[PDB]
Amino acid sequence: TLQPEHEKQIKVLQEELQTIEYKSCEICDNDIEKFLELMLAYKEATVNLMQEMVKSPSILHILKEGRLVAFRDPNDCLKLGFVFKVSLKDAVCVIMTFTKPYKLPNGEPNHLIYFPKADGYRRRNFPKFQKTDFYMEEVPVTAIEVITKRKFAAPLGKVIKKDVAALNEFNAETNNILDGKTLKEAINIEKQGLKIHQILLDRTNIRDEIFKLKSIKCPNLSQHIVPKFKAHVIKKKIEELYHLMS
Ligand SMILES: [Zn+2]
């Protein structure tokens, strides 16, 4: 064949694709795929949203120093941190992370999207985050998925210097957030932008439709979405390697 490598890798991805076990559920077997595609649509909508938000300097007033946000590391893990610095030219943010990468009891990264103002969904998929010694990490603005309303007053500068007075308030606030968390995302997009509102409306529609499903009420959806997710990734990779879809 004129394409040995392509064939090899394709065969591999196919095998790995069909070697996936799907656990049965009387609450997901009906509408879980739609939940998946709609979820990915939500994620994409958020990405584009952040892409359009970083354009207007108003974003600095949204991600002011000490802004609690939920981003994702290269491994698609959800982390909570504070906004320390923002760069418009590079579209990157210096976030101080106080939480380890959220992972299932299995060990694999959680692929579920965190929906603000969703007590049930939270309690079912995101029971609690584990605290970790804070460390500065740069992350692209596009990675941010949730922008909470809560903000850390004390300057992070003193926290970096490890001043006891600052570390007390930092630890207290952090433990406050982790003990009981009812994150609520509120963004004042009315300030500027036109496409922003459209993206917001569309995303809210996607959410209204996704919460209408039955898999959304599932207790163990966080573990049931894994196989479908992996199968999705592998599938897309296969279609690509096949030079298919033009
Ligand atoms: Zn289920």
Side-chain angles (χ1 to χ4, degrees), residues 12-14 17-20 22 25 28 30-33 35-42 44-84 86-88 90-99 101-116 118 120-122 124-127 129-148 150 152-154:
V12 173
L13 272 54
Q14 291 177 342
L17 175 58
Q18 291 183 340
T19 53
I20 301 181
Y22 300 90
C25 170
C28 288
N30 48 17
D31 49 23
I32 185 180
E33 298 178 351
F35 180 93
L36 180 55
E37 59 177 355
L38 271 52
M39 185 183 64
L40 298 178
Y42 182 95
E44 180 182 2
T46 301
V47 175
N48 297 329
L49 185 161
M50 302 306 300
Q51 293 180 349
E52 289 291 342
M53 176 181 296
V54 68
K55 299 181 179 181
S56 180
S58 300
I59 184 180
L60 278 59
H61 274 60
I62 306 180
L63 285 64
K64 49 188 176 183
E65 186 181 20
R67 171 64 65 177
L68 178 59
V69 294
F71 61 93
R72 289 189 176 271
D73 65 337
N75 296 332
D76 190 28
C77 303
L78 190 56
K79 299 179 181 179
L80 308 177
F82 293 97
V83 179
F84 176 74
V86 178
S87 179
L88 297 176
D90 297 325
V92 297
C93 297
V94 179
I95 305 298
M96 179 177 57
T97 308
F98 60 86
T99 301
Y102 193 98
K103 299 179 180 180
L104 294 177
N106 186 331
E108 299 182 0
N110 192 337
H111 307 284
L112 279 297
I113 301 301
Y114 191 93
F115 294 97
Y121 177 82
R122 163 188 167 271
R124 293 186 294 267
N125 298 273
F126 293 88
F129 280 89
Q130 300 184 8
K131 185 177 180 178
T132 304
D133 301 332
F134 69 90
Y135 66 102
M136 296 303 174
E137 177 187 9
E138 64 176 10
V139 55
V141 183
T142 63
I144 304 179
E145 293 186 347
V146 177
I147 302 182
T148 67
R150 293 175 54 89
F152 188 75

Side-chain angles (χ1 to χ4, degrees), residues 25 28 218 220-221 224:
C25 170
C28 288
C218 162
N220 296 17
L221 175 59
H224 293 191

Side-chain angles (χ1 to χ4, degrees), residues 207-211 215-216 218-222 224 226-227 229 231-234 237-242:
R207 176 176 178 177
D208 289 20
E209 182 179 359
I210 196 181
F211 275 91
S215 300
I216 187 62
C218 162
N220 296 17
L221 175 59
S222 186
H224 293 191
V226 174
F229 186 91
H232 176 78
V233 176
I234 300 180
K237 300 177 62 177
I238 294 181
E239 294 185 352
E240 174 186 343
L241 291 176
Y242 246 148

